Design a protein around this ligand. Structure first.
Ligand SMILES: O=c1ccn([C@@H]2O[C@H](COP(=O)(O)OP(=O)(O)O)[C@@H](O)[C@H]2O)c(=O)[nH]1
Ligand SMILES: O=c1ccn([C@@H]2O[C@H](COP(=O)(O)OP(=O)(O)O)[C@@H](O)[C@H]2O)c(=O)[nH]1
Ligand SMILES: O=c1ccn([C@@H]2O[C@H](COP(=O)(O)OP(=O)(O)O)[C@@H](O)[C@H]2O)c(=O)[nH]1
Ligand SMILES: O=c1ccn([C@@H]2O[C@H](COP(=O)(O)OP(=O)(O)O)[C@@H](O)[C@H]2O)c(=O)[nH]1
Ligand SMILES: O=c1ccn([C@@H]2O[C@H](COP(=O)(O)OP(=O)(O)O)[C@@H](O)[C@H]2O)c(=O)[nH]1
Ligand SMILES: O=c1ccn([C@@H]2O[C@H](COP(=O)(O)OP(=O)(O)O)[C@@H](O)[C@H]2O)c(=O)[nH]1
Ligand SMILES: [Mg+2]
Ligand SMILES: [Mg+2]
Ligand SMILES: [Mg+2]
Ligand SMILES: [Mg+2]
Ligand SMILES: [Mg+2]
Ligand SMILES: [Mg+2]
Lengths: 131, 131, 132, 131, 132, 131
């Protein structure tokens, strides 16, 4: 069961003071922080790498600008079935009960990123936590 | 995709002291109050207008009775995709995660009303905020 | 209209201090407590009865050992459609918004039991509150 | 400094649906339930015993009336310095931050009782949990 | 027994999305809303009246500009000893447990106004709800 | 007005899953995270330095053992009057309304450290954040 997954707390969370609300939802589901970094302004290369699959999309530049417009936190979380469960926890802006469902309402500004597969998770954990 | 929708806080919300809890869920999802009005008792006229589409139903008079049995608040909310999102937030007594899902347990006394279409929004806003 | 259903708060709720959290979710949905008992350690035959339909499963022994590993609370809740609505409230660990969806992440240690039918309700009520 | 104290959840807690809110504050401060008992209506005998020290006061019968006007829960709690700490938690309708401070507004209907001394704890526990 | 008092939710509560949080604190203490108005922008003379006793202070102009910088809500609350108890609820930024103690950290932007006496209550109620 | 102060999230917070609850209380008072580190097990020299003034007290060894018995988070917080306000926010295990007042009940295991003066704050910020 045991996996690790990468979470990003996005800048809209810092602006709207939802940082703890978000982290708290994950904690209460019993996932453990295994490593964590605070970035006051994330190095733009890091964000470009992080959203590489998106480099061709029309939202890519606006996206990068946003991800660098305020602080972010990068967290590695550990627990049973972590990648899938934290993804569900993240949710979408349509359906309530989730982080995005309760607290967000934008296609770009949605508070949180969570890895969506075992592969994107190893990759993302290496970008943000090379060590 | 900026919209405006009409929300009623129903008399059972006041009876059960859930007014802030309900307004808070809508506030947390980033919707903004544009107009608001407290009615210690609503004119049955306005209630019957608001529920005109239901005028030929069994529950029609019970519902009107309840709607005037105590205070209500009429709020116009605004934000991206307001009508549909606030409708999901309202949800139903069957789905936990929503206002009715977490807090209500009845076909009639269900805490809240939210416009369900662009047309009923424009119409209901006009009922409650004729000015 | 009105039904009664049986809830068990499991020992992981005590270990994790979530007792109030769970009871509150049911309280905020307007369900009323009609009976309630705190068992610092529930007698094993009560537990085995409660889970009797499960007696031939691979997990049966482990489940009972767990349910006896800490305190539990048994509660009869009353309200409209109590049985099915508290079932929905409990939910499962895959479904955000529910008790298990927000707070549990295990196949066995999942915080709460709730009757799933009218018969299991009637039966489980009698097991934990035989005085009727 | 392990102690045991007796807490009553009063009938106004049930009326106002604050039972979990109250138990939750005591749970969050790390106190553990040692015994608990639900009374749909308490025998006036037990109430009069519990409040024996008040038997000659103006409010004595009103208080007994209220105490039997609806359910109550009697709980024995345990943890370091339980009697005094749970008393502070209970607080009063004047000081926000406590159970009565945040939630109650009356001299009689004040949600909760907590033992105030080592002696009244031993005595009250014996009233409610004679076994 | 019963009193009524005037509460203002200040524009920093809208900016910070704390409107429900603040109103909830007052609601959970069993105070009832008896009147309420949302002002997307309160007329300046209403604000100046409301703070008229403050007209000669160094902060007077800045305060009024602030109070007009966003929406505000005016509310009459009713309950036992409403005036003094909601004052206590509001508290100050030095006192944890109160609205300002937990959520505010500024001399001017402090979320909430509440009447401090029976006379200021009666007067402030008339300013924001002149229809009586 | 503007100061910075050092906060430690102690291991009892990780054990009891109060990490977000604690950080959230500080966030809602409007203080900003300015830097932050997650330590799965803090280097014992760091903790010895951190509690130097205490090196002669009888609790010093038990204290160090505890501070290294689980994870801790070190945070630098910024805001008006930060050192004094976060100290009040931290509080003590007696009086409710605070982090310690609501959530703690031990002389050693009390969830959080907060610097108590402009001097201890520069010092502590340098131990945990040499850069
Ligand atoms: O049209 C879009 C879609 C995506 N995004 C942003 O870029 C990320 C794109 O990844 P994806 O569409 O897969 O969203 P996710 O999987 O994280 O839900 C999202 O988190 C958004 O914040 C955006 O700005 N515009
Ligand atoms: O059988 C019913 C159905 C409706 N209602 C009330 O009338 C409103 C309109 O009914 P509808 O099915 O449209 O509920 P909605 O989900 O739209 O609010 C509901 O909110 C209820 O408060 C009722 O009393 N009995
Ligand atoms: O593989 C399993 C499945 C069940 N359980 C436990 O025993 C109960 C089994 O009943 P069921 O699968 O029907 O779960 P529930 O009805 O409570 O949702 C669960 O709640 C778990 O606590 C278990 O230990 N192992
Ligand atoms: O004037 C009063 C004082 C007391 N009480 C009730 O009787 C209890 C005991 O009074 P006391 O002053 O000891 O209150 P305590 O703070 O100890 O609970 C209180 O909790 C109230 O519920 C009352 O009805 N009227
Ligand atoms: O130096 C000051 C003091 C007051 N205020 C503002 O104006 C009100 C002043 O009234 P008072 O000092 O009596 O505060 P309150 O009675 O609301 O506690 C405060 O709430 C602040 O919003 C200000 O802007 N500067
Ligand atoms: O008798 C004691 C007193 C202190 N402590 C621990 O060591 C720290 C000592 O610092 P101080 O007594 O000044 O506590 P604080 O100022 O942080 O409240 C406390 O946080 C406790 O966690 C302890 O273990 N035993
Ligand atoms: Mg994706
Ligand atoms: Mg409809
Ligand atoms: Mg089953
Ligand atoms: Mg007393
Ligand atoms: Mg004043
Ligand atoms: Mg100190």
């Amino acid at each position: 069961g045991l996996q690790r997954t990468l979470v990003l707390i996005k800048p809209d969370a810092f602006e709207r003071s939802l940082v703890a609300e978000i982290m708290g939802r994950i904690e209460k589901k019993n996932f453990k922080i295994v490593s964590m970094k605070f970035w006051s302004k994330a190095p733009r290369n890091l964000i470009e790498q992080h959203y590489k699959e998106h480099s061709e999309q029309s939202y890519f530049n606006d996206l990068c600008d946003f991800m660098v417009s305020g602080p972010i936190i990068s967290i590695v979380y550990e627990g049973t079935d972590a990648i899938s469960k934290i993804r569900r926890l993240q949710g979408n802006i349509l359906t309530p009960g989730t982080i995005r469902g309760d607290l967000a309402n934008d296609i770009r500004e949605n508070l949180i990123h969570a890895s969506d597969s075992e592969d994107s998770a190893v990759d993302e954990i290496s970008i943000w936590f090379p060590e």
